[PDB]
Amino acid sequence: MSCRFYQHKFPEVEDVVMVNVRSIQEMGAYVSLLEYNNIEGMIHLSELSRRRIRSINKLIRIGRNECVKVIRVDKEKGYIDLSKRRVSPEEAIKCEDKFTKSKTVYSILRHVAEVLEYTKDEQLESLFQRTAWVFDDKYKRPGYGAYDAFKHAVSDPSILDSLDLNEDEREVLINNINRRLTPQAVKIRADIEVACYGYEGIDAVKEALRAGLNCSTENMPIKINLIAPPRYVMTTTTLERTEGLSVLSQAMAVIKEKIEEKRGVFNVQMEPKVVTDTDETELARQMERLERENAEVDGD
């Protein structure tokens, strides 16, 4: 169970990526070409440090990863030669991103298997080569392809038509891609205080709330309820952390206009507060929403 970022499948004499040292030798320095997207590797000290040479201890030494390029592999078993010849930052950067996207998608599937009970090593590595790396090879991309496709597969499932998966791994995996790439509107909530001192101001009070709920946008439903007299609650479901509250405030100013224009007043109580994806965990220890009532005078 070593390969993982591509079930083992690299070209010949053209692999530029970042590896981690493994065994250092005086006549060569063995390294680890990622125990997932490739395998181990052997570098040539006679072609790694020109001029004098001691032990390339300033390059790779048990705990020092670096970016090198393969020079020749062996088909008699599967070996890989390594040399740096002074690589450029453009290459070390192309690899840093290749694993950045290949690692996010790699972990994204690791969690999908973690919930569907896929900790049999070969299993997660099987899904890896049966989905993320299948698309990467679909457009001939070293991880970069599967990632972009994993981000567009949320609205363009026309490419996931050849994905013969189970209804549990197809819906859970897709649910994970969106939960990690395209979310579904954010939960926002701000507090406001509308008041129209006057028996004829009640028309601005009701027209005001409707104005705040009407300033919203398509696919962004807003809910404003009253929990007390000088206080209200305005929530909704609008993507974007700032734009969402941007509509909440736009409503707080609109009502401020639909209430002050008729001799009224407006007062925020907790400003616009957006909800994140991790807040869903602390929302279970809070609870108690309507039980916060304090008026206990039923009778005289």
* Cα 12–chain centre separation: 33
The experimental technique used to determine this model is NMR
**Rounded Cα gap, residues 113 and 124, in angstroms:** 6
Superfamily name with CATH number, domain 88-184: Translation initiation factor 2; subunit 1; domain 2 (1.10.150.190)
Give the start-to-end residue ranges of the domains of the chain: 1-87, 88-184, 185-300
Q: Under CATH, which number does the domain 185-300 receive?
A: 3.30.70.1130
Residue 131's Cβ-side half-sphere holds a number of Cα atoms within 13 Å equal to 26
Burial grade of 92 (CB within 10 A; 0-12, 13-18, 19 or more): middle
**Rounded Cα gap, residues 91 and 66, in angstroms:** 12
Q: Quote the crossing angle between the two packed helices 241-260 and 202-214, to the nearest 10°.
A: 160
Compute the Cα dihedral for 201, 203, 205, 211 and give only its sign.
negative
Return the structure tokens found at 109.
Answer: 């599937």
Q: Which residue has the tokens 């869903």?
A: 280
**Rounded Cα gap, residues 257 and 259, in angstroms:** 5
Top CATH class of 1-87 equals mainly beta
Q: What is the CA radius of gyration of the chain?
A: 29
CB 109 within 8 A of CB 150: no
Strand partners, 68: 17
Strand partners, 20: 32, 65
The reply to whether 1-87 and 185-300 are identical in fold is no
- What's 6's DSSP letter? S
**Residue 264: helix, strand or coil by DSSP?**
coil
Dihedral class, residue 156 (left if φ above 0, else alpha if ψ from -120 to 50, else beta): beta
Q: How far is CA 152 from CA 138, 148, 181, in A?
A: 14, 6, 9
Please give the sequence-ordered ranges of beta strands (E in DSSP) within the chain, or none if there are none: 16-25, 28-32, 41-43, 65-74, 79-83, 187-190, 194-195, 222-228, 231-237, 265-266, 273-274
